[PDB]
Design an enzyme around this catalytic site. Structure first.
Site, short mmCIF file in Angstrom:
data_model
loop_
_atom_site.label_atom_id
_atom_site.label_comp_id
_atom_site.label_asym_id
_atom_site.label_seq_id
_atom_site.Cartn_x
_atom_site.Cartn_y
_atom_site.Cartn_z
N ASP A 34 0.84 -1.20 0.00
CA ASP A 34 0.00 0.00 0.00
C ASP A 34 0.87 1.25 0.00
OD1 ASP A 34 -1.90 1.93 0.30
OD2 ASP A 34 -2.54 1.32 2.31
N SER A 67 -0.31 15.44 -12.18
CA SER A 67 -0.52 15.07 -13.56
C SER A 67 -0.73 16.32 -14.40
CB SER A 67 -1.74 14.15 -13.68
OG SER A 67 -2.07 13.89 -15.03
#
EC number: 3.4.23.22
Length: 330
Positions: A35, A199
């Site tokens: 994770d 992004s």
């Protein structure tokens, strides 16, 4: 040193991925959910309330000659999905596919919430976010990667998750045969403890690429791709009959639909998520309404590049002094 281990979807939908981990001496192998969005290595154990264990493999510290109770240390964690766990702490030897850390904090669960009990395939979590998020008190503990970093050939790990197929976590090296083209690296902010990056935009199917900054985290422990409502609406607008359902908790679409791809930007590069990766199947057994793999982050406070996005790429978690993230097509 290096390590390499295969990671396997837990079910036919890729709801999560499990990777075998050896704990203790003699080794006890547990299947852990790696994770990158949390920083605790915790396991179902012989201390877990019996009624909260339903098929998981347990760690029994009393059977490990290298286990030592970390005196006074406790842990308690809550995840984004409503899930929770807590317990005490041992140090023990932990190995992932050839890479060994001695003295790793292994957080033994005394309590787990319903969603963990109900998932017999996941024996615990191995956190790979930054150690500043580790919940052990009163002395915070280091992640497996943090403990291994100095010994690794290169202070990196890579995630190569498969769509409906096995994949690989590598520690300490970049497998240049595992991706196409080049790896594009992008800056990371560690201030929140996550692999947080920006992004450069997105496209829906063969549509126009939209240049827009989308801050988010690379999180292998989240199943879906959570993005701003404007972006998610633009995606589902291209799917006939798709709609946001308040009853169900997100966008659903007719199971008969063919989904468009979704492209996200990494610097000047582009990662393409095939449409099929965005289908999470019937909302309930036998339904013809299917759950979407791209959902709004509105009720989260952060955008999350979860497995739906990460599985479309070869992802480098570069833990050099100034961490960065790398993405390549594959």
């Amino acid at each position: 040193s290096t390590g390499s281990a295969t990671t396997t979807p837990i079910d036919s939908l890729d709801d999560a991925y499990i990777t075998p981990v050896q704990i203790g001496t003699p080794a006890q192998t547990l299947n852990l959910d790696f994770d990158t969005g949390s920083s605790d290595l915790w396991v179902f154990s012989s201390e877990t309330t019996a009624s909260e264990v339903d098929g998981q493999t347990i760690y029994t510290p009393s059977k490990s000659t290298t286990a030592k109770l970390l005196s006074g240390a406790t842990w308690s964690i809550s995840y984004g999905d409503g899930s929770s766990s807590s317990g005490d702490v041992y140090t023990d030897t932990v190995s992932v596919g050839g890479l060994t850390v001695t003295g790793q904090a292994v957080e033994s669960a005394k309590k787990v919430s319903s969603s963990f009990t109900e998932d017999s395939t996941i024996d615990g979590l191995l956190g790979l976010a930054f150690s500043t998020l580790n919940t052990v008190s009163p002395t915070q503990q280091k992640t497996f990667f943090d403990n291994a970093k100095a010994s690794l050939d290169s202070p990196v790990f890579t995630a190569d998750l498969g769509y409906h197929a096995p994949g690989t976590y590598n520690f300490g090296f970049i497998d240049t045969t595992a991706y196409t083209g080049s790896i594009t690296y992008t800056a990371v902010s560690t201030k929140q403890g996550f692999w947080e990056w920006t992004s450069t935009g997105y496209a829906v199917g063969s549509g126009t690429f939209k240049s827009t900054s989308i801050d988010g985290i690379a999180d292998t422990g989240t199943t879906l791709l959570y993005l701003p409502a404007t972006v998610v609406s633009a995606y589902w607008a291209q799917v006939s009959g798709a709609k946001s359902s308040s009853s169900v908790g997100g966008y659903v679409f007719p199971c008969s639909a063919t989904l468009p791809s979704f492209t996200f930007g990494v610097g000047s590069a582009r990662i393409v998520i095939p449409g099929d990766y965005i289908d999470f199947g019937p909302i309930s057994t036998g339904s013809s309404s299917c759950f979407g793999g791209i959902q709004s982050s509105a009720g989260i406070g952060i955008n999350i590049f979860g497995d739906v996005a990460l599985k479309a790429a070869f992802v480098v978690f570069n833990g050099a002094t100034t961490p960065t993230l790398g993405f390549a097509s594959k």
